[model samples]
Target: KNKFIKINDKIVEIDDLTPTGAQILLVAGVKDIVEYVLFQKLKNGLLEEIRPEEKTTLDKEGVETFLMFNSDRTYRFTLNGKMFDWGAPSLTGATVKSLAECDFDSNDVWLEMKNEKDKLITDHEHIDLTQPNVERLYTQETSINIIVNAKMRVVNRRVISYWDVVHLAYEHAENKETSIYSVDYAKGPISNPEGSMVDGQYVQLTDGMIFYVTQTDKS
Candidate 1:
């Protein structure tokens, strides 16, 4: 006699077959009846199958970030956060700093990856394009804020090299053409004793470590 078996809520038609355990196993697409029948519950004289747990495929786009930049920027061929090559002439190999370099107004930015309904996948407040470490900023990690020539910078790591601080300070300094003569480190009542923050030094950056750049030879 022919029989119908319910496997994973789908009806399987068996022609020229009997209501045997082996036959049910074959119809259910399971190799062993003992293993198959272990998870299933018997109902209405048939096996009510309990399928194996399935791993959900959650949308990755919500966490995935893109480097947004102007069309008239650097790099005709570029790499992304993961160091993958994408050719679009403009967005090629662009970093988060690229946005800041182009003077991108952070207030006007939005999530590029969106839902099917065109809703932003991530919150705008969660993104900061000016940051050098895009992944750290995106993941909401704690950052160090150091004052460089009155301008505030958000850095990912705790330690910052003397040269790095000097470079930042020089860029922000009004006298770009002038050479940097010295950098004085100040924290509260205490200060660096004469050129400690010189060419070959690094400091464990804090929230408000002030770096004063001294530039010279400006015409």
Candidate 2:
């Protein structure tokens, strides 16, 4: 994955704050208030107004310490304007209008790909949310249904489905280990089996495309 960098009058190093090993990353910058609105909605999962203090930070240019999720995750900025702490989201969703994709662009770090054949090998099984074993995950039983909104057809492989969560959990769990503190504690239980998370976004390529959109932590 390409590293994130902030460009003001010049380029500056952006501290990588994703939980070590976690596959998620945040890309943010705002030239207008609407972009800030989108970032806050995406990051915190809420629809809210930008307050005065937030406006103050967004109104400047250059890097600044931005706080998110009570964690150390930080993204450098060449922001055109203010700083605002959009609080954690109470609900989350990813929507894609279709299941189409092009050659994998190395732009978004949260993406992964395997050949269609390899996608079929589900050597291990994760505790499905519908089963009793999932109750033991994270030391508590939860029924949070993060929708796996898949938009591509690589042939349905349940094993590949299991691998999705297994890999995601292992990655996420690894991050908790390396960070200074367990910042992930606040971002509680989530599961999106089927790895169909792109909601409805799609790209067209002869190879294929799939989208995995989801909603998590409702329990």
Candidate 3:
């Protein structure tokens, strides 16, 4: 859960890549994390405020660059893709729900992983905001999972068809929409184990399903 951060041209090895505002200052030798404001320099040539609790998922490629200054107070940042200001450098998971107005029994506040799965922030959890990007948070209604053409994918709907396979597999490839082709599948729910489908037929989805698409006439 930790990584190295380059602070003020000084190389320091830290345990967390996912850090909080306070940890950066603590690493900078500041007796009080609240006494210092940390600024992390980013690849895009921009400066960012590492709020005390905005634990941004630095999952993507990054070089942990930063600078800290003395000064603090209320702060403003993004949530659910919108801008909001807060009185301090930190937030708790319960507080996030209160601020976003979207936390319910079934739905929870999630930290956007961006390229991967988003995390569900539970009550009493403290969110750290010591990264280079906005720690985007949001709520989702419903989403399912799948493995199409042997690659894992997330699907929003239950039903799918032959054309769906063609599009999902070869939308940009040599296969033409009008070209006669064969579509076969494997790994389905017990009801529909494995079979090929006509262009108009539909199939139920399974998390571990696959599709093989090819031309019908290829001598």
User: TM-scores of the models, in the given order?
Assistant: 0.29, 0.14, 0.32
Candidate 2 lDDT score relative to the true structure:
0.24
As for TM-score, the candidate ahead, 1 or 2, is 1
Q: Return the number of clashes found in candidate 3.
A: 13
Q: Per-residue lDDT tens digits of candidate 2, residues 1-219?
A: 233323222333434433111111123333332223222222232223323234212213334323223222222211112222222321111110001121222111111123332111011222222322212111111112222233223332222333353233344422233332111111112232122222122221122223332224323
All models, RMSD in angstroms: 21.3, 22.2, 15.4
Q: Candidate 2, which segments miss by more than 4 Å at Cα?
A: 1-29, 33-36, 39-52, 55-219
Q: Comparing candidate 2 with candidate 3, which one achieves the higher TM-score? A: 3
Using TM-score, give the best candidate's number.
Answer: 3
Best-first order by lDDT: 3, 1, 2
Model 3 residue 131 CA deviation in Å: 49
CA lDDT of each prediction against the hidden true structure? 0.42, 0.24, 0.66
lDDT of 3 by residue, 136-161 (tens): 77655424466666666776544677
Ranking by TM-score: 3, 1, 2
Give the runs in model 3 whose Cα sits over 4 Å from its true position.
Answer: 1-142, 172-179
